[PDB]
């Protein structure tokens, strides 16, 4: 029934963040896995590490909260929703916040973040922004 995992994952992270739960659990999938890796790279979270089982495993993520109990991440937006997939040419890749945020884009040569995708001239399915 559950339409697409990315919406569930983003909204679960947002729900955990607005009340500042230091722990969080997500059912494990490949795409969600590298997305967590991407947020770890960009420093929007504290750390992510995995646990495996017979039912698509689980991934657990530890959210950063800055030096003084302030939101490291202030929002998340899915834009390539099921029923309306949005695809961006390489040149029109969005500069979210003209730099501050990040947009994650699936590309013909892997799933990349905004600036590096623009740097190496790749387009494709742009899935979400991070605020």
């Amino acid at each position: 029934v559950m339409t697409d995992p990315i919406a569930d994952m983003l909204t679960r992270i947002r729900n955990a963040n607005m009340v500042r739960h230091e722990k969080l659990e997500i059912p494990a999938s490949k795409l969600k896995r590298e997305i967590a890796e991407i947020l770890k790279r960009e420093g929007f979270i504290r750390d992510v590490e995995f646990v495996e089982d017979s039912k698509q495993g689980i991934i657990r993520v530890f959210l950063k909260y800055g030096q003084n109990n302030e939101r490291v991440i202030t929002g998340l937006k899915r834009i390539s929703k099921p029923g309306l997939r949005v695809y961006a040419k390489s040149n029109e890749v969005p500069r979210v916040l003209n730099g501050l945020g990040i947009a994650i884009i699936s590309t013909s040569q892997g799933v990349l973040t905004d600036k590096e995708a623009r740097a190496k001239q790749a387009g494709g399915e742009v899935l979400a922004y991070v605020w």
Binding site: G83, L84, R85, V86
Partner: protein, 84 residues
């Protein structure tokens, strides 16, 4: 040299009730102009057959030709796979 290649289409049979001729549907489809959501659309044709090889349900490949008859413009190339 080699001449220009006429277009080649892919589709499914939707009628075979007429001798030496075969009607096909092609699922070619677009996205809405001002919304940009993929939407399904069907185009049907009449194609020419020589011995009624194709039957209802078959999947056939198609190439256009000169006008052979009114409303008929296409030839049967081959029956790539046959129905149940």
């Amino acid at each position: 040299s080699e001449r220009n290649q006429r277009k080649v289409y892919q589709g499914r049979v939707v009628s075979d009730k007429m001798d030496k001729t075969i009607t096909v549907v092609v699922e070619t489809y677009k996205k809405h102009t001002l919304y940009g959501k993929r939407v399904k659309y069907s185009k049907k044709f009449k194609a020419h057959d020589e011995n009624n090889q194709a039957k209802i349900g078959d999947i056939v490949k198609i190439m256009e030709t000169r006008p052979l008859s009114a409303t008929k413009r296409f030839r049967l190339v081959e029956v790539v796979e046959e129905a149940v």
